[PDB]
C-alpha cells in the first residue's frame, strides 16, 4: 500500500541516541529525548502529505492518602527525596513537601470546569490551570 | 467539590521557569520544559488518590508533495535548515535532506499494521516502529 494515513504510535526506537549525537544535539537534550514516545499523524491525499509529530513522556504515578505522609522522589523534576503530606483545607488539597528546599509544596482545587495547581518553592510560585477533557 | 476525578489538560502555566530554577533544574532542561503541555489523570476514591501526569510537545507541521523539494527547519531536533526531497521507491517514501550533514535523510514504509521509519545521519541509523491506533 501507498496509503500512510492514520495516527501512528511509537512502539520501538533503536539508536535514537547515536542519531541525535550525529546531529550534534547536546547531552542534556539527548538524556530527555531518549525517554520520549512519539505519535505521528499523517494526512495523505495522493502525493500530498500533511504530517505532525508529537512527543510524550509519562511521569511516575503519585498515589497517596490524604493525611498520611509518604515518600516522594521527584524523578521528573529535580530528582529529590521529600516527605509529602497532603491535607484538606476546605475543598483545597494542600501538600507540604518536607525536604531540603524551604516552603516547597503545592495546592490543588477545582473551580468550575478547571483544576488549579499552585506549585511553590522558596519565593517562587508557579500557577497552572487545567481544563477537563 | 472535593471530586478531583478526571483527565485534566493544561491550559495555562505561569512562572514554571522560576519554579524550576528554584529547584536547580539545569538550563537545557528548563528550555525544553517551558514548551511542554501537561495532562494530569486523577483517580480518586474518598481520601485515596492515584495520579499520573504526562507531558507532551507538538513538533511543527511537515507538509510536502512527493517529488517537490521543500525547505525544512528541524526545530524540534538540531534546528538546522535542510532542503528535503521526498520520492517514491515502490511503496517506500525516501527523503534526502540536503544540507551540511552528509547522507542525512529518512525512509518510511508500512508492513501490516506497522509504520517503519529509518532515520540516517552520517554513519548512524535510527530505526523506529509505530503501530496504527
From Swiss-Prot, chains A, B:
It is found in: Cytoplasm. Keywords: Cytoplasm, Retinol-binding, Transport, Vitamin A. InterPro entries: Calycin, Fatty_acid-bd, ILBP, Lipocln_cytosolic_FA-bd_dom. This is Retinol-binding protein 2. It comes from Homo sapiens. GO terms for cellular component: cytosol; nucleus. All-trans-retinol binds at residues 40, 108. The keyword Cytoplasm applies. The lineage of its organism: Eukaryota, Metazoa, Chordata, Craniata, Vertebrata. GO terms for biological process: epidermis development; fatty acid transport; vitamin A metabolic process. Intracellular transport of retinol. Belongs to the calycin superfamily. Fatty-acid binding protein (FABP) family.
